[PDB]
Design an enzyme around this catalytic site. Structure first.
Site, short mmCIF file in Angstrom:
data_model
loop_
_atom_site.label_atom_id
_atom_site.label_comp_id
_atom_site.label_asym_id
_atom_site.label_seq_id
_atom_site.Cartn_x
_atom_site.Cartn_y
_atom_site.Cartn_z
N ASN A 108 0.81 -1.21 0.00
CA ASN A 108 0.00 0.00 0.00
C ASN A 108 0.85 1.27 0.00
O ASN A 108 0.33 2.34 -0.31
CB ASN A 108 -0.95 0.00 1.20
CG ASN A 108 -2.35 -0.43 0.84
OD1 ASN A 108 -2.62 -0.79 -0.31
ND2 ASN A 108 -3.25 -0.40 1.81
N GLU B 116 -0.76 -22.45 -15.00
CA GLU B 116 0.33 -21.81 -15.74
C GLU B 116 1.00 -20.71 -14.92
O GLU B 116 2.18 -20.42 -15.13
CB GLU B 116 -0.21 -21.26 -17.05
CG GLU B 116 0.81 -21.17 -18.17
CD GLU B 116 0.20 -20.64 -19.46
OE1 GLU B 116 -1.00 -20.88 -19.69
OE2 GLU B 116 0.92 -19.98 -20.23
N1 LIG Z 1 -5.61 -0.79 -1.23
C1 LIG Z 1 -6.58 -0.97 -0.35
N2 LIG Z 1 -6.20 -1.29 0.95
C2 LIG Z 1 -7.11 -1.50 1.93
C3 LIG Z 1 -8.46 -1.37 1.59
N3 LIG Z 1 -9.19 -1.61 2.71
C4 LIG Z 1 -8.34 -1.88 3.72
N4 LIG Z 1 -7.04 -1.82 3.28
C5 LIG Z 1 -5.85 -2.07 4.13
O1 LIG Z 1 -6.01 -3.32 4.79
C6 LIG Z 1 -5.44 -3.32 6.10
C7 LIG Z 1 -6.34 -4.01 7.12
O2 LIG Z 1 -7.64 -3.46 7.09
P1 LIG Z 1 -8.93 -4.38 6.79
O3 LIG Z 1 -8.69 -5.26 5.59
O4 LIG Z 1 -10.10 -3.47 6.57
O5 LIG Z 1 -9.19 -5.29 8.09
P2 LIG Z 1 -10.29 -6.47 8.00
O6 LIG Z 1 -9.83 -7.47 6.97
O7 LIG Z 1 -11.67 -5.94 7.67
O8 LIG Z 1 -10.25 -7.19 9.44
P3 LIG Z 1 -11.02 -6.56 10.71
O9 LIG Z 1 -11.58 -5.20 10.36
O10 LIG Z 1 -10.04 -6.43 11.85
O11 LIG Z 1 -12.16 -7.47 11.13
C8 LIG Z 1 -5.21 -1.86 6.46
O12 LIG Z 1 -3.82 -1.68 6.68
C9 LIG Z 1 -5.68 -1.06 5.26
O13 LIG Z 1 -4.69 -0.11 4.95
C10 LIG Z 1 -8.85 -1.04 0.29
O14 LIG Z 1 -10.06 -0.95 0.09
N5 LIG Z 1 -7.92 -0.82 -0.74
#
Ligand SMILES: Nc1nc2c(ncn2[C@@H]2O[C@H](COP(=O)(O)OP(=O)(O)OP(=O)(O)O)[C@@H](O)[C@H]2O)c(=O)[nH]1
Ligand SMILES: Nc1nc2c(ncn2[C@@H]2O[C@H](COP(=O)(O)OP(=O)(O)O)[C@@H](O)[C@H]2O)c(=O)[nH]1
Ligand SMILES: [Mg+2]
Ligand SMILES: [Mg+2]
Lengths: 155, 247, 423, 424, 125
Positions: free
Chosen positions: C197, C245
């Site tokens: 990210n 693949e």
């Molecule tokens: N690129 C991108 N990164 C994301 C997005 N949503 C969350 N992240 C990243 O994912 C990481 C974890 O957040 P989440 O995936 O929302 O956590 P979760 O999987 O919902 O798990 P919990 O909320 O703890 O139940 C964070 O560091 C965010 O920066 C997205 O929509 N796009």
């Protein structure tokens, strides 16, 4: 896996469905469990058009398997004279050895394929080549009562 | 200090597992239909489990079609995979084969000891050992004798070897009025001598063990009567095994 | 050959939206599911009423995010049984995602996957979208991957992980969650595309010209690059036409299955040459994971061009880079750059800050320099685990403390595995 | 993770409690009758958290407090059933609140707590406001907490506990009561905001230049802090969204969950401010110890974790820069072994009467200074055994005081350990 | 058995510290008394082995830690062939390692030669 379907076809001998699978970019040198490419399998079971199709698409003519068997080994074992000359014309290893020390000349002599023996010989086969036990193609004709082969081996 | 039976573990039910295209596949003319049908329930349905359901489960519909093949099915492969199924039932469902189950497969199995292919004799005999270790000597003692008297040489040597197997694991302790003594001299001994006096040596040699495993159980003095009637030459072969054999 | 996609946590779910938004534009599919117009049915199934439904499952241990799916632009596209939500989230805790909360919903989720796999005839495998640092994304995914290796064991599974970055990071314990899932998901994943990210942040600030990007900004960029990787599966190209693949071409070691993806060009909406974009594939500024491939050896390398591309221009640009740069390969590699082309133009979103470009490329390359990314996580992990900081949260939700160490050793072993290949 | 059940216990509990409901009712656009007269969706997006009408339970052994709440401004809104009140008062006796009189009433309270929890889509946890030097807010509150902890162990427990100071009441048994109560909170709550009356007086006296601060003056600082720390919880936002996630990113060791809150700018009761503060100015009210609601110097310890909440329209770019700045320009004050331990979040809706504001929740080891003060006063009192017959008469054992004394000292030592810890 | 059979249900209670505790209490009515003069031990072993999978996967650290002790005290009396057929298989691998590590540190015959505490009738005997 598209490389595994091309082995199924080249073995069982569906000439048309090789072209289908190869038009889908299947691995011409895809290995099965024991290292056998489709060229191995087609050369074992006598599918001449499938051999020539794979070779012109870049099949490893001198590819070995887990036991050191080239397609020329297997063609000379089973006795596919049509395929033997196709492989040799595509640069096959006339004096290839496998894990048991046999050359294609050993296998064609053991199985009594006198017509293939003569073709291999004229492509520079090693008549004095030995196996693990230490026996030449000429020793096999002596051991196996084949005077027709003994004469063809000293020609 | 008493020990546990580990069998206390909860049981598993396999009736629901069988598929609709099963009865017609086992009752088919194509051998590979039958084989696959049997082989499927063995590798998928029986081999996984470790305890079948004692309560309210009737296997005597399934077991009588295992017998139908073990006896009559011309495919030796379908026999082999069936007797291994039979064993699995008798093994994973101990204390079940009281009569109906045990007897439904017993006499078919003894018929098929005729098979000489090592893998198949392996499977048939090992299944006979199963039905014995949970039904010995309910019907087997009598019927095992019957098939020692049978015309095929192979069934004689194998069903006699069976009595030998069973006799080494023969069990106490009532009074000495168990089923073995009620029929000892009358039947067991009269039938074991028929093996001991067979025309073939490999047959005779099975009798020699099966008689020296017998003396070990019931006293080399009790059977000294038919010992005398036997050749001095056969006697020292019988004694040979008596010195090595354990029950 | 019908691939199933799975989206776990907000990260998966919200990147999922961006990808299926972009898939439906590339395939001329409508928000209601219709189509006025096969290779694309790898991803979509079909209703009797001419409606095209994704082969997708959305999972989150909490409604909020998936609630917006089923009250949004594409609410009609998904069947409601595909969108699964719990109530209590994992609260940035791998333990809750994997052990405490995840066990309460895993069976419902596996069941709803079976309904999509039962509709399929020759199922290939699974695409899985999830965060690292998230509790759901880490814990539940790793659990789901374990159980998919049983219920579908003889087929492929591909990851799309979101590598964490302090600029958008929501939790302190994100190193923990990253290590924990990568340990337990290592054996169960055939190939895995990491997305830093930070790189996506850097790219959007430089090339899209945004001061403070939002998640939408990051997704548009990520979904574009995900589309570039899955384009071969959706349009019947020549390269990477099925999920096996990907492993054949990019994975010459079961464990080391983490390709670096590089995407050019990223042009603001306010044309380049084939040679110019292929040079940008070897520029670190356009990578999805922040590392330096110059410090590492390439195990494999694929180029996925799409658009107005002449096959000869490619061979020139390849020879340029193979001659005028020093891309070090390992000695036991076929040292041949694999290529495939798809003549359809890169679709962008109407309104997007990303501009429509004439041609584009996505280079997938399993370089050993990606070990640098594992080193950054492992280090942050070590600092906190040295004091057993935040560990009570995990241990108090059904997790043995030992699992921390067992995971760390598996990450140390992986760092050695990257080293020995590259020496 | 949606609803929060709120509790207020004792005089102080219901005072700063009601003040809190006054503040966030306005912010969410609710009138005293309980009707929405707002003008924004960012207001009713997460109104379900604290409201249904507040999800608030009012508790006191002192029956008079009942009327002091209802005769207040927003006193009409609270559910009549959720008032649970005793006949007599505890009279600054923690034992009376925890063992004798407060224990008799605690069942009635749990009945209402159950009622409000019963009709929750998905409970987050609880929220208790109370003072620690009292008898009811401390003794019955801590007893209520444990009683909830065991009835709702799958939920968060979050307290706004205010520390006694001689500057606000000359009662000498408060060190006893607060020590006994801290012995509870360290074992029974996930997170506790330490509101120090010592620091509230020192802010009203020295910074706000009020020669005699009243409770109302100190309560103004509190209610504004509470709305600040609960901003994440009450409005849409990515970071520190729910109670558990907050505690997960704030509490690295279970016993060390005592946050030192502080916020900016410090305003008087209804006074006027110049030009809304700048982002770098707000940011420089973090280490500024004159903005801490606990009487501790962050300079004298180290931050384990920090949460910053910026409210108002401002540059997210500049806030990121200023926070990233202030961290590394004071790198020796933030613990090294917890990387990215400071977390910042922005909410566009500012607080009432201010164009911009910033609240600074910090788990700083300096908080040991606070527990030092309480313990020394406790020990001075306890070594002469003053007023012990109050507590022992109510069924308490002299041993309990020794254990609470020792347990607070272990808590101080733990903070000192991690302060002197090194990453090396 | 009768005491054991009554306090078994409490393993399935909301409050962890109760199941945390009464698994410790179950485990030390065993280590000091043991199974003797028990009519149907098989029925009893099944009844106390049944919850041990869930207890060992319980959220609470204490409930788990104190369940491995109850496992050991059953092994300490007729383990481990039996417990590996019935219960070791189902626990986390890390867990069954700790249980094996716990059995090495155990010295003394497979059933204990003498009980650390005797019953009513047993003591005069
Ligand atoms: N690129 C991108 N990164 C994301 C997005 N949503 C969350 N992240 C990243 O994912 C990481 C974890 O957040 P989440 O995936 O929302 O956590 P979760 O999987 O919902 O798990 P919990 O909320 O703890 O139940 C964070 O560091 C965010 O920066 C997205 O929509 N796009
Ligand atoms: N900040 C603040 N502190 C208070 C207030 N009322 C009482 N206190 C403090 O709380 C302690 C007295 O406890 P109190 O809550 O009045 O007793 P209780 O009713 O039994 O809980 C002393 O330290 C007081 O300084 C108030 O309105 N605001
Ligand atoms: Mg989430
Ligand atoms: Mg009061």
């Amino acid at each position: 896996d598209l490389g595994k379907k091309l082995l199924e076809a080249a073995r069982a001998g569906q000439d048309d469905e090789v072209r289908i699978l190869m038009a889908n970019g299947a691995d011409v040198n895809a290995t099965d469990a024991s290292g056998l490419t489709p060229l191995h399998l087609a050369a074992t079971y006598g599918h001449l058009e499938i051999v020539e199709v794979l070779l012109k698409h870049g099949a490893d003519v001198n590819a070995i398997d887990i036991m050191g068997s080239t397609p020329l080994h297997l063609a000379a074992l089973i006795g596919h004279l049509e395929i033997v000359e196709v492989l040799l014309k595509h640069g096959a290893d006339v004096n290839a050895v496998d894990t048991w020390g046999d050359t294609p000349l050993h296998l064609a002599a053991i199985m009594g394929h006198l017509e293939i023996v003569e073709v291999l010989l004229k492509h520079g086969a090693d008549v004095n080549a030995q196996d693990k036990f230490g026996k030449t193609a000429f020793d096999i004709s002596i051991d196996n009562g084949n005077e027709d082969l003994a004469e063809i081996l000293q020609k | 200090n008493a020990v546990d039976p580990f069998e206390l573990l909860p049981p598993s039910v396999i009736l629901d597992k069988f598929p609709a295209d099963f009865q017609t596949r086992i009752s088919s003319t194509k051998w590979k239909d039958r084989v696959e049908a049997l082989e499927e329930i063995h590798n998928n349905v029986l081999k996984p489990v470790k305890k079948l359901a004692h309560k309210n489960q009737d296997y005597s519909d399934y077991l009588r079609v295992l017998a139908n093949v073990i006896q009559k099915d011309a495919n030796v492969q379908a026999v082999t995979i069936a007797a291994n199924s039979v064993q699995l039932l008798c093994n994973s469902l101990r204390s079940n084969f009281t009569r109906s189950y045990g007897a439904i497969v017993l006499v078919p199995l003894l018929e098929r000891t005729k098979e000489k292919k090592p893998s198949v004799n392996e499977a048939i005999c090992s299944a006979l050992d199963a039905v014995a270790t949970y039904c010995g000597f309910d019907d087997c003692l009598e019927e095992t004798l019957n098939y020692m008297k049978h015309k095929t040489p192979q069934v004689r040597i194998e069903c006699t070897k069976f009595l030998t197997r069973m006799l080494q694991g023969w069990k106490s302790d009532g009074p000495l009025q168990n089923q073995l003594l009620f029929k000892l001299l009358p039947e067991v001994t009269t039938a074991v001598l028929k093996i001991v006096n067979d025309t073939q040596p490999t047959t005779r040699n099975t009798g020699f063990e099966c008689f020296a495993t017998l003396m070990k159980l019931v006293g080399e003095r009790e059977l000294a009567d038919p010992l005398e009637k036997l050749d001095n030459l056969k006697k020292k072969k019988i004694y040979e095994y008596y010195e090595k054999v354990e029950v | 050959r019908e691939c199933i996609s799975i989206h776990v946590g907000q990260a998966g779910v919200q990147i999922g939206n961006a990808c299926w938004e972009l898939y439906c534009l590339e395939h001329g599919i409508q928000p209601d599911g219709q189509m006025p117009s096969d290779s694309f049915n790898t991803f979509f199934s079909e209703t009797g009423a001419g409606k095209h439904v994704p082969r997708a499952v959305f999972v989150d241990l909490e409604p909020t995010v998936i609630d917006e799916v089923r009250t949004g632009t594409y609410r009609q596209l998904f069947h409601p049984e595909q969108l699964i939500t719990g109530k209590e989230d994992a609260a940035n805790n791998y333990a809750r995602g994997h052990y405490t909360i995840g066990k309460e919903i895993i069976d419902l989720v596996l069941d709803r996957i079976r309904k999509l796999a039962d509709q399929c005839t020759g199922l290939q495998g699974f695409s899985v979208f999830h965060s690292f640092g998230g509790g759901t994304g880490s814990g539940f995914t790793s659990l789901l991957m374990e159980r998919l290796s049983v219920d579908y064991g003889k087929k492929s599974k591909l990851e799309f992980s979101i590598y964490p970055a302090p600029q958008v990071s929501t939790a302190v314990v994100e190193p923990y969650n990253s290590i924990l899932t990568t340990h337990t998901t290592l054996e169960h994943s055939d190939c895995a595309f990491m997305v830093d990210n930070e790189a996506i942040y850097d790219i959007c600030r430089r090339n899209l010209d945004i001061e403070r990007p939002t998640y939408t900004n990051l997704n548009r960029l990520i979904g574009q690059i995900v589309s570039s990787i899955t384009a071969s599966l959706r349009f019947d190209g020549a390269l990477n036409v099925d999920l096996t693949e990907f492993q054949t071409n990019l994975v010459p070691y079961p464990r080391a299955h983490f390709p670096l993806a590089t995407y050019a060009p990223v042009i603001s909406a306010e044309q380049l040459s084939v040679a110019e974009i292929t040079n940008a594939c070897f520029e670190p500024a356009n990578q999805m994971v922040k590392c330096d491939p110059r410090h590492g050896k390439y195990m494999a390398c694929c180029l996925l061009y799409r658009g107005d591309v002449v096959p000869k221009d490619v061979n020139a640009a390849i020879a340029t880079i193979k001659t005028k740069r020093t891309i070090q390969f390992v000695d036991w590699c076929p040292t041949g750059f694999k290529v495939g082309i798809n003549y359809e133009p890169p679709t962008v979103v109407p309104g997007g800050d990303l501009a429509k470009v004439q041609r584009a490329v996505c280079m997938l390359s399993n370089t050993t320099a990606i070990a640098e990314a594992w080193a950054r996580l492992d280090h942050k992990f070590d600092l906190m685990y040295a004091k057993r900081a935040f560990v009570h949260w995990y241990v108090g939700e059904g997790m043995e403390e030992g699992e921390f160490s067992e995971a760390r050793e598996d990450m140390a072993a992986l760092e050695k595995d990257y080293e020995e290949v590259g020496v | 993770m949606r609803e929060i059940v709120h509790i207020q216990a004792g005089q102080c509990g219901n005072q700063i409690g009601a003040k809190f409901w006054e503040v966030i009712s306005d912010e969410h656009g609710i009138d005293p009758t309980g009707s929405y007269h707002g003008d924004s969706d960012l207001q009713l997006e997460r109104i379900n958290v604290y409201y249904n009408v507040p999800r608030a339970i009012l508790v006191d052994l002192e029956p008079g407090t009942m009327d002091s709440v209802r005769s207040g401004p927003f006193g009409q809104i609270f559910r009549p059933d959720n008032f649970v009140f005793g006949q007599s008062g505890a009279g600054n006796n923690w034992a009376k609140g925890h063992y004798t009189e407060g224990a008799e009433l605690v069942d009635s309270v749990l009945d209402v707590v159950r009622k409000e929890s019963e009709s929750c889509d998905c409970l987050q946890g609880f929220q208790l406001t109370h003072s620690l030097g009292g008898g009811t807010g401390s003794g019955m509150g801590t007893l209520l907490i444990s009683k909830i902890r065991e009835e709702y162990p799958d939920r968060i427990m979050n307290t706004f506990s205010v520390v006694p100071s001689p500057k606000v009441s000359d009662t000498v048994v408060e060190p006893y009561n607060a020590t006994l109560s801290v012995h509870q909170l360290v074992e029974n709550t996930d997170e506790t905001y330490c509101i120090d009356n010592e620091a509230l007086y020192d802010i009203c006296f020295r910074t706000l230049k009020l020669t005699t601060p009243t409770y109302g003056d100190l309560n103004h600082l509190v209610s504004a802090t509470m709305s600040g720390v609960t901003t994440c919880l009450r409005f849409p936002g990515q970071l520190n969204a729910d109670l558990r996630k907050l505690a997960v990113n704030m509490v690295p060791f279970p016993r060390l969950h005592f946050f030192m809150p502080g916020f900016a700018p410090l305003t008087s009761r209804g006074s006027q401010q110049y030009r809304a503060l700048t982002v770098p100015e707000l940011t420089q009210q973090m280490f500024d110890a004159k903005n801490m609601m606990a009487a501790c110097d962050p300079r004298h310890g180290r931050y384990l974790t920090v949460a910053a909440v910026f409210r108002g329209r401002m540059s997210m770019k500049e806030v990121d820069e200023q926070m990233l700045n202030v961290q590394n320009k004071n790198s020796s004050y933030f613990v090294e072994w917890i990387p990215n331990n400071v977390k910042t979040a922005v909410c566009d809706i500012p607080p009432r009467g201010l164009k911009m504001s910033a609240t600074f929740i910090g788990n700083s080891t300096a908080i040991q200074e606070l527990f030092k003060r309480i313990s020394e006063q406790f020990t001075a009192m306890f070594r002469r055994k003053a007023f012990l017959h109050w507590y022992t008469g109510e069924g308490m054992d002299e041993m309990e005081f020794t254990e609470a004394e020792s347990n607070m000292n272990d808590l101080v030592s733990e903070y000192q350990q991690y302060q002197d810890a090194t990453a090396d | 058995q009768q005491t054991v059979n009554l306090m078994l249900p409490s393993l399935s209670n909301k409050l962890p510290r109760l199941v945390s505790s009464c698994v410790k209490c179950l485990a030390t009515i065993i280590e000091e008394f043991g199974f003797i003069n028990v009519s149907d031990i098989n029925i009893l072993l099944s009844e106390i082995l049944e919850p041990l999978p869930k207890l060992s996967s319980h959220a609470d650290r204490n409930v788990r830690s104190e369940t491995m002790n109850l496992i050991l005290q059953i092994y300490k009396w007729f383990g481990k062939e039996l417990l590996q057929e019935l219960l070791l298989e189902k626990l986390k691998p890390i867990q069954q390692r700790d249980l094996s590590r716990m059995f090495e540190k155990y010295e003394g015959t497979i059933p204990p030669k003498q009980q650390p505490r005797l019953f009513q009738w047993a003591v005069p005997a």
